[PDB]
Design an enzyme around this catalytic site. Sequence first.
Site, short mmCIF file in Angstrom:
data_model
loop_
_atom_site.label_atom_id
_atom_site.label_comp_id
_atom_site.label_asym_id
_atom_site.label_seq_id
_atom_site.Cartn_x
_atom_site.Cartn_y
_atom_site.Cartn_z
N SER D 371 0.93 -1.08 0.00
CA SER D 371 0.00 0.00 0.00
C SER D 371 0.97 1.13 0.00
N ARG D 372 1.04 1.96 -1.08
CA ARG D 372 1.95 3.10 -1.12
C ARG D 372 1.29 4.05 -0.15
N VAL D 373 -0.08 4.09 -0.28
CA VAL D 373 -1.12 4.59 0.59
C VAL D 373 -0.69 4.54 2.00
N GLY D 374 -0.58 3.31 2.54
CA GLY D 374 0.08 3.11 3.77
C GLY D 374 -0.65 3.71 4.93
#
Lengths: 167, 467, 466, 509, 128
Positions: D371-374
């Site tokens: 998840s670049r989101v993270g």
Amino acid sequence: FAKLVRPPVQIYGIEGRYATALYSAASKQNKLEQVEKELLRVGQILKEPKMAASLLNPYVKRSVKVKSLSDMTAKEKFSPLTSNLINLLAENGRLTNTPAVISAFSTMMSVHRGEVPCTVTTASALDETTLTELKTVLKSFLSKGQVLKLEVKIDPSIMGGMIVRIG
Amino acid sequence: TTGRIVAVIGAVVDVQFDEGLPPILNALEVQGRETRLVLEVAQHLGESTVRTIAMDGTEGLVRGQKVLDSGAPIRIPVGPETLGRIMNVIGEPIDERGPIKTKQFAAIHAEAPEFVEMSVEQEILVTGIKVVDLLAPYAKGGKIGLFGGAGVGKTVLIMELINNVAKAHGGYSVFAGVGERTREGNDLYHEMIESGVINLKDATSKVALVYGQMNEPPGARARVALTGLTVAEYFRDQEGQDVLLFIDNIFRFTQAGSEVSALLGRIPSAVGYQPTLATDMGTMQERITTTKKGSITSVQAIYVPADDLTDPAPATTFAHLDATTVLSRAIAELGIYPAVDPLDSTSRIMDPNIVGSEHYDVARGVQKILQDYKSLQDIIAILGMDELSEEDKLTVSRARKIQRFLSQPFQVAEVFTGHLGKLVPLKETIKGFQQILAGEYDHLPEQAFYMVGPIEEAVAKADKLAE
Amino acid sequence: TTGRIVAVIGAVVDVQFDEGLPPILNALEVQGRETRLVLEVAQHLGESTVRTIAMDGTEGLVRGQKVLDSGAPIRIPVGPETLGRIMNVIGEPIDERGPIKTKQFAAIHAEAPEFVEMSVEQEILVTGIKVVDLLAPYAKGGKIGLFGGAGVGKTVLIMELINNVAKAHGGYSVFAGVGERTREGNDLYHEMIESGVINLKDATSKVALVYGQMNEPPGARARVALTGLTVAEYFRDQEGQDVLLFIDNIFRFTQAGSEVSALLGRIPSAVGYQPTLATDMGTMQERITTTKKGSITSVQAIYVPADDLTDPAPATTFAHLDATTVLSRAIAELGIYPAVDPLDSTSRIMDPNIVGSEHYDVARGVQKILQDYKSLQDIIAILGMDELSEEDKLTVSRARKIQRFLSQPFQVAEVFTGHLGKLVPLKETIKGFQQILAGEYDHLPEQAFYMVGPIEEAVAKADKLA
Amino acid sequence: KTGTAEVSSILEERILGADTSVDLEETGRVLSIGDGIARVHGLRNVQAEEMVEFSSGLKGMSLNLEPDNVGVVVFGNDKLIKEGDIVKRTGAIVDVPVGEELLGRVVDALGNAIDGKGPIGSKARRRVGLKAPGIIPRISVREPMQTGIKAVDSLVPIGRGQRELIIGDRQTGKTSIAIDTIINQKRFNDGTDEKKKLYCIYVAIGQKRSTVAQLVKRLTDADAMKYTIVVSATASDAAPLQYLAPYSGCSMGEYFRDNGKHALIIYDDLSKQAVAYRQMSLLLRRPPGREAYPGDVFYLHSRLLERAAKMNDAFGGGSLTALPVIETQAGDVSAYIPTNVISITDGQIFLETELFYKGIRPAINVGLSVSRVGSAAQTRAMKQVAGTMKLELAQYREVAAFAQFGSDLDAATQQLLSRGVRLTELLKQGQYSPMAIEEQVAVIYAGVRGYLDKLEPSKITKFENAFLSHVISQHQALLGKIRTDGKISEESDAKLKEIVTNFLAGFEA
Amino acid sequence: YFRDNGKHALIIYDDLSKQAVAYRQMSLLLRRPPGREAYPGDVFYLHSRLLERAAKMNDAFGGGSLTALPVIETQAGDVSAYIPTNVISITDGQIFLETELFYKGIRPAINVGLSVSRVGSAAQTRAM
């Protein structure tokens, strides 16, 4: 869908698909001859340049090709609906094709269903009858001046080679 | 409706009927074709013409020739009368033993059950070949894929399979030999005859045969597949059964589908494969299942295209496969008949949630161990033996025993085996393997376990080999 | 002139004008399509029929229907008041802060500027990214093709560059969200807002945002390139500025084109491409320039399609590049940020004169060792590294260290990494690698080298590692 | 000349002057039919994008309005029809009936039941053609979000709106992976609120009915099915149907989103769609492109997926969380659609399938799972253990790297491997075993605080259960709290530890 | 013009690779079919002919010459590539340059092993 009239000739597609339409059109009402004839008349009345190849410019567009050939059935006096199919060749550029479409159509009356002889035959001319090569027998056996530059010389040819062909 | 040959470009016969163009799929019968010329309507091409495929080989034809539409798709005999009989695609006795007396006909297309009819949770189809069942616990209605070294008694096994279940559990079987060598179907034929599974005194030879060998139109051969399906559908729904649909080769079918496509003017996708490769698959596979009435458990022989299976189709096929039969020539080479690849012949369904958790554990434990032994061979190979623990030794032996215990004598091939085959009630099977695993026999020769039937009988063989 | 919907075959809207035809590319407005439905004249099909492309959706649209030519191609408002406003391709908010007022228009085609007009020199600008600078430092007005990553790296990289840049350079910028992933731009928006570079109390940000999202028809996406391009030319010349052209991702344009040519019933090319794939590109790229009236430096996200560059299309692309950052996902997989193909991460003007020779030579040395190492893994892999002269083994190791030292972690993705953000002045850099090249450091571990700014910190980290 | 209809009945009256005429304006006659593409003459006054309806009642979509005919892609079968057939407009584009009483329902893509509970209770219809929202409408995902697969939720920290790829090969219960994910949400659906709930739309693409049958059954059993649509275009499905199903879903999830709701559409599986769609293109002779795929399949997916987002409040705050599926061939991802999806999706969950097969459940390729989101997607609680854990696992993996030698290293690293193994056990979570979060972080916590590193890996899990049952009984209290705080408290920790020690003490040593 | 006007001319074709691309495109746009790699093949003829127009003449022609240094820029050294293959079949050598040397700093960066003019080794220099 519709009645599909496939009278002998019949172009077997190939842009007398109109013809096949019109063989059922013609056949409906049996304005067969009328239209057959319409078409002859039309035939060169169109096919000459005379307003017609001018109108067969691309460059005149069906803006008013729809308004001058079409209105050449109007310009002429044919069109018992025979222009309307024109107006179709009009888009469908088949105008340039028409003679043949007519050919296929016609040939003429019972002529609609002709035939010209070949294999060993010299002879040119259609066949309108039922059984045939009675007439052809009696067609040759008409004149006797006759050609062989109207077809077959069986002569150079048929067996002219054959002995050679054995050796 | 009669139509006229308007174009024959190969078996694409374009027919113009100036008469009705019914729906597509309709089998058309050519008038003037003294051997049954089915055309399957393929397209309504437009302007009174349909595109057909001859499902047969063409000749003599004239453009214009009259064809009379059978008004439906190809309809074929369905019913018991096929059992112990060979029909071709058109159904026609390529048993060549006169006709087959059916009345029930079916158009060979059929469909996927509609959803509500879905017996939602499949249930193990019991192979009863201990090992087989164990490692691949099939599902009733399941698609089993057969990867495998040919003619090992491939067929023997199959024959045997038919025997084992379809007799046992009174199911039925279909073998649709698709695209096969006529020779191979021939061989098989007698082989069944020979086996007695084909009985010629009974057309209740547990298999109905349909063959659509490599000489028919691809589609036609392909459609022998549908045919078989249609029949099997008869037996499932109508006969309420678990029909076994043995198919050889689903690949050849695949190729065939693709084969028509080109010619069908299609753009047939990857590998040249029909774009509809999938749909073809789907619809047929989706026809296969377990209805409420029964099961069509599809046992599909799988030819290894490009010795690969990532060939998009097999790759896809996997989705449909649920139990995998990887046959192991190695296991065979060890003389072990069953010759199955154990640790690759698997069934997804294999779960503890499903197919008993015990079974499962035993299986997993087994698989694990079998693998572990598998490891040890490698070790020992290089390391001799008893350079290592006796627990390894024990297990090795056990594994081996188990191995041998997997070996299941065979029942018509007393001629090959010098034994008679045997069938194994499941529980004792589970138990069986667990027991050996539990090493409860550790003083009995392993060679005993060779060609054993049920575990008691293995105990029995144990005894005899234990003198 | 007004047209008749004659065929809508997909968003190729075949329009028949029963009036004069304007040129190709005249924008046609679908009447009854208030939602500004430009169809772009694409072909004069003949018989006053054009093939057009709808750039906006086509539904409800009957054949027959009326389309009105605007008498020109797509002209859109242009002007600085956009700097801190997001326009869609048709030069209209997607800032959605109502509409922006500009009083200048442009048809979205500018043309290739005459050669003489060029600032014929472009000169080292820097990024502070060691690796970048090292291999491929910026210049001034140049288009860099940025390859590779997602924004695990790529997209990140761009951003990061941005992070330093608009700010640091007075970098007048255009952001072209090409076939944009809306979301990131959304996020970004708020960031920009946040960052205040998008300052909204003054729509004189450093940057005008143009987003031309994926969601638009290909036609729309295809054309935004021209648009953005147009803007930047305005901004450069007209607005005098030092433009940065951020393109993310020009590939997606390319992709739009290919589809389009196809859809145009026309031949695409090999791999599905377009014949004119190049020429549109070429001509676009040639519209791009740093004349002397400012600069358009392009930062071009170029999504390597299917990550294959071999792919003629990227192959072509290269011609238009003058500095490139070619990543290595290969490297990236190794964790790495920044993760590069080093052996084509460039600035063409890699030269000991241009860059100092220290850089240069060091770079040549670096390129050398790393390459040599590159030969060697393969060997090592097919062996061990043991046979291979230990010195080499050393260099190999060093090479990784160099690698690790190239690894540069960022602030914005401390967030991700759990690991500090860094930018590195060049000299310290030259020194850095040069030192590793001097190999004294050698004894110290790879991981010391990993993810740092100055090597010094790495030295620090090494000790700390110890 | 040669288009066609020049030897139809088309010309055949047009000869005569078009004589007798009706539509070909709003109905058309199948000019030719083949390929489920009914070249339909006429319909001429038709919309653009009209859904049409066939004389066989089947649907079609008038995609291509050609000057002569409408190439109408048929959502059906022409073994069920024949030429010249009347195609009647519906007048309308594609909409799908939409309704939330489909929650608790399995439908076909046409929005008709396949649940066989007769007709849909839907009363709305809604464009499947619906647009992706705007920039501004979308707003960032402050939300966390779970699967109940701790490992997933943790290392993939999730939000609602999020496009996230489920990627891996072969039914590992590939679908299973999804199943558990769903099951967990049940508690949330047994929890409260639309945003503290997620409406599941399982668009099942190409997934044979059998797959469904079981599956649905599973859902039934869990009857989380109640808040769930399963839009199902199985394997059988006509390609446009199969194709359509996601788009259908697309209407529906946006709906929910737009009904404020936080919706979850699981687009399951776009691979199958793509295949179909490409196929569809190709059948239209409309091209392929790269990898045989025509390129707006990206657009497809964008079109599809962009419509999945997390909105702000002006936009109902909405979400549609999209869980697309791609099943890989072999991690073949230049595979266009993987390429696409990666770039579209907002992370992807790679599974290292072999491992699964080696038995690992979960079997994630975490390294690639991202998840670049993270961070926006996670609780502090989780951050406290998990944050560290991921990292620590970063090292574990790093040191799992250098397994040639073994753990004859330094203790830390020897440990990292051990610990790692432990963490693996903890990250292994049975299938059909979704947990609520606080317990999860808890269960992680021990091991990450190294406590369980005495244990042999098997007993970790064992512990975990046992431990679970312990807290379940007693420290149920504490779970109450942790649940309350959304963070782990010093106390809670301490107590947790203490629990742990007691538990441990209870566990064996 | 020069050549035949005795002089010695040098043409550097940088690059026919691009040329082919254009041409092909042009062809395709003519609907005139491609060939291999979407390239129709008489781009060879074209070029071949072009290159056939390069020459060293006798004295009647002023000793005339036009020396052609075509450049084809490889893409990943793909000699294989049609046009490269083409050119290969045409050439009087090719000079393969490898990047790797360039990276070594080795500049010239030649891939000598492949670099050849066989023919050239009489049109040279006794000194050398």
